[PDB]
Design a binder for this molecule. Structure first.
Ligand SMILES: Cc1cn([C@H]2C[C@H](O)[C@@H](COP(=O)(O)O)O2)c(=O)[nH]c1=O
Ligand SMILES: [Mg+2]
Ligand SMILES: [Mg+2]
Ligand SMILES: [Mg+2]
Length: 676
DNA sequence: TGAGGTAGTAGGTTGT
DNA sequence: CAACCTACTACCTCG
């Protein structure tokens, strides 16, 4: 069904004939920069030149004449002083139709925007974000409201303003004044004298004048010598975690720290319904257009298509995965689950047992319920009891416990994993009428035991879909993959992740993970898939998939590679009527937006932005399959994830491995979704 | 640890 | 600089 939408973009004035002919400048650096320093040094010169100037080629493009630029100057970069001189090389017309020249024009537009926002008052400007009014406030804190903005140039050579309302949380208070108001220690804190932030561990209470530092001086006079007490009091010692040393806590002074505030530190919800968001968006667009002399905003329209609604199946039709609990699962198998109580009570709660029994009765499969009597505090004998349970056929464990600290949770999880037992935690103040929570725990539990709760019924170009992501927060990451195999997504599998330096997944790693998913399809179907759908979370780094793609071509398997971007897709509003789910909005060549999840009384949806990197499947069939796979996720009973199931799975996989470690997974079946 | 969503907070990787 | 990502917590509501 055809329809039309507004984007949160606004067409403004045509570029005047001066802006269409920017000045070019050649850069001469002394000494000449190295291969690694050249491109970022050019970017630095662009900023240092002043006016409105950006990198273009090996040089600069400016909307200021050279006479009002800082043409000669200095540049500090990683402890080295470069002298730069700019040589003007005339003006030259750029054409908005040539995408490269248009790209230089858009870069100049973004620069124009930042610089012109700097001259707004009295509002709070932070780069490309502006905050206009105060939304809420309290003892020592306040929440401003404004918008994040972008500016670029259209192919017809007119400005395009993107606007998205946003809130900002500010603390105009020292750590001392904050704590004196009765508030608890914030998790994060910031230097009052600079931008550097620390993680606040605790309050040391020893004397700051008798606290020696690594180097002789006491805390107090170290900060005094740097002229930081000039204007404020030192206050108490605070201990902050070393950003680059998790083992050696660092001393500091609460009088020189300022709390950084999150929602955890302050009842006011900050999302907007889409109608209100759109309204504010238009108001801010016209305000900006008028203040910056960009003209009157004209809203951009795009043709949008409504994709068919997927038909989810348990034993029979369902609308949600929680329905499989009453109606039966897609594929049931003989299962055994164990209960571990960390709360001091006895056996299975009756309603949980009843619900499990009903589910397996409807599914026509046999259920065995076990109880773990041993406690994890018993060290190795506990592992012995676990091994006895697994030996007796147990596939997963439900842990009924009071809320656990992250460290204890991770430890328990890992311990169970090492014996090949995935676990589902359910927190122990538990009421039978809290149905959503415990039913969701039951779904988690069942997916972790390797059951397939739901599947799709449609016809899709690819019968294997695989998602790739990277996770972890240390100096290294884990690159991983998860897949939905079969035309129905009838099996969900993860593969052992790999440690990598950063976000880029090595080519051979990509191929090895994919190959494992191909092999999974081989074991299920007894053949190779005719076509696979490759979903990369975020951008595809240069040639990351080249080896995998060729490898697939050598096997005669067709493919589509799709970059799935969670941000950057802007906003999508209906021109008329209600905002509905499953909107496919094509844009430029190979790219499109996809609104996958929305319901009333939520905030404004955030459409995915998708780029077809390789393959020849029509954009709409891709959009269709991705939208449908978004409904395959088994562990969320009542709300579908924004990302298609293989990517939601991959994300959670690498996240959990980044949390626990990869060393625990050797005996855990890849059909068991331990990370959900 | 119930889960997803949309929100906010911080910091990180890729590559001209 | 680019245009994206990580991962935490809060409230709302339960396809
Ligand atoms: C100079 C110095 C500072 N520090 C700590 C105390 C300061 O509060 C903290 C941060 O100071 P900074 O912001 O100048 O880096 O560094 C040491 O632990 N040892 C030292 O030798
Ligand atoms: Mg990612
Ligand atoms: Mg992720
Ligand atoms: Mg879970």
């Amino acid at each position: 069904g055809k329809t039309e939408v507004f984007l949160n973009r606004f067409a403004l004035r045509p570029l005047n004939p001066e802006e269409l002919r920017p000045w070019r400048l050649e850069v001469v650096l002394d000494p000449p920069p190295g291969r690694e320093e050249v491109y970022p040094l050019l970017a630095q010169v662009a900023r240092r030149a002043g006016g409105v100037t950006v990198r273009m080629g090996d040089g600069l493009a400016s909307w200021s004449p050279p006479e009002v630029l800082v043409l000669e100057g200095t540049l500090a970069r990683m402890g080295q002083t470069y002298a730069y001189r700019l040589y003007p090389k005339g003006r030259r017309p750029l054409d908005p139709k040539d995408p490269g020249e248009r790209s230089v024009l858009s870069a100049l537009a973004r620069r124009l925007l930042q610089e012109r926002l700097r001259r707004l008052e009295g509002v709070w400007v932070e780069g490309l974000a502006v905050y206009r009014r105060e939304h809420a406030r309290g003892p020592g804190w306040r929440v401003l409201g404004g918008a994040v903005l972008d500016l670029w140039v259209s192919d017809s050579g007119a400005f395009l303003l993107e606007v998205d309302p946003a809130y900002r949380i500010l603390c105009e208070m020292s750590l001392e004044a904050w704590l004196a108001q009765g508030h608890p220690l914030p998790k994060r804190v910031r230097n009052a004298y600079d931008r550097r932030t620390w993680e606040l561990l605790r309050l040391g209470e020893e004397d700051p004048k008798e606290l020696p530092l690594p180097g002789g001086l006491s805390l107090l006079d170290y900060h005094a010598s740097k002229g930081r007490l000039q204007g404020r009091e030192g206050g108490r010692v605070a201990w902050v975690a070393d950003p680059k040393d998790p083992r050696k806590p660092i001393p500091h002074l609460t009088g020189l720290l300022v709390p950084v505030l999150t929602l955890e530190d302050l009842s006011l919800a900050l999302s907007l319904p889409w109608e209100e968001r759109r309204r504010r968006t238009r108001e801010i667009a016209s305000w900006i257009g008028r203040r910056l002399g960009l003209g009157t905003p004209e809203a951009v329209r795009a043709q949008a298509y409504r994709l068919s609604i997927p038909k989810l199946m348990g034993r029979r039709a369902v609308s949600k995965p929680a329905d499989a609990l009453r109606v039966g699962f897609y594929r049931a198998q003989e299962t055994a689950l164990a209960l571990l109580r960390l709360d001091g009570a006895q056996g299975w709660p009756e309603f949980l047992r009843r619900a499990l029994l009903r589910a397996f009765g409807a599914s026509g499969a046999s259920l065995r319920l076990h109880t773990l009597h041993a406690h994890p505090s018993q060290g190795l004998a506990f592992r012995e009891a676990l091994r006895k349970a697994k030996e007796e056929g147990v596939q997963a464990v439900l842990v009924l416990t009071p809320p656990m600290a992250w460290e204890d949770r991770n430890r328990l999880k890992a311990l169970l994993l090492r014996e090949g037992l995935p676990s589902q935690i359910l927190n122990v103040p538990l009421r039978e009428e809290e149905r959503h929570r415990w039913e969701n725990a039951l779904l988690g539990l069942l997916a972790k035991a390797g059951l397939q709760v739901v599947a799709l019924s449609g016809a899709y170009p690819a019968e294997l879909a695989v998602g790739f992501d990277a996770g972890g927060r240390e100096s290294f990451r884990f690159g991983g993959a998860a897949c939905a195999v079969g035309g129905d997504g009838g099996h969900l599998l993860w593969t052992l992740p790999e440690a990598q330096a950063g976000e880029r997944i090595p080519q051979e790693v990509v191929w090895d993970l994919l190959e494992e998913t191909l092999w999974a399809f081989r074991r299920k179907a007894g053949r190779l898939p005719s076509r696979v759908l490759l979903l990369r979370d975020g951008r595809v780094p240069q040639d990351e998939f080249a080896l995998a793609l060729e490898a697939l071509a050598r096997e005669g398997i067709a493919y589509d590679l799709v970059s799935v971007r969670k941000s950057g897709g802007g906003r999508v509003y209906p021109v008329q009527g209600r905002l509905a789910d499953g909107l496919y909005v094509p844009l430029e060549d190979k790219t499109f937006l996809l609104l996958t999840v929305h319901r009333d009384f939520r905030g404004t949806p955030r459409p995915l932005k998708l780029v077809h990197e390789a393959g020849d499947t029509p954009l709409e069939a891709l959009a269709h399959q991705i939208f449908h796979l978004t409904r395959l996720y088994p562990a969320s009973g009542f709300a579908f994830p924004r990302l298609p199931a293989p990517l939601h799975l991959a994300d959670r996989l690498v996240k959990e491995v980044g949390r626990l470690g990869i060393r625990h997974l050797k005996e855990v079946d890849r059909e068991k979704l331990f990370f959900v």
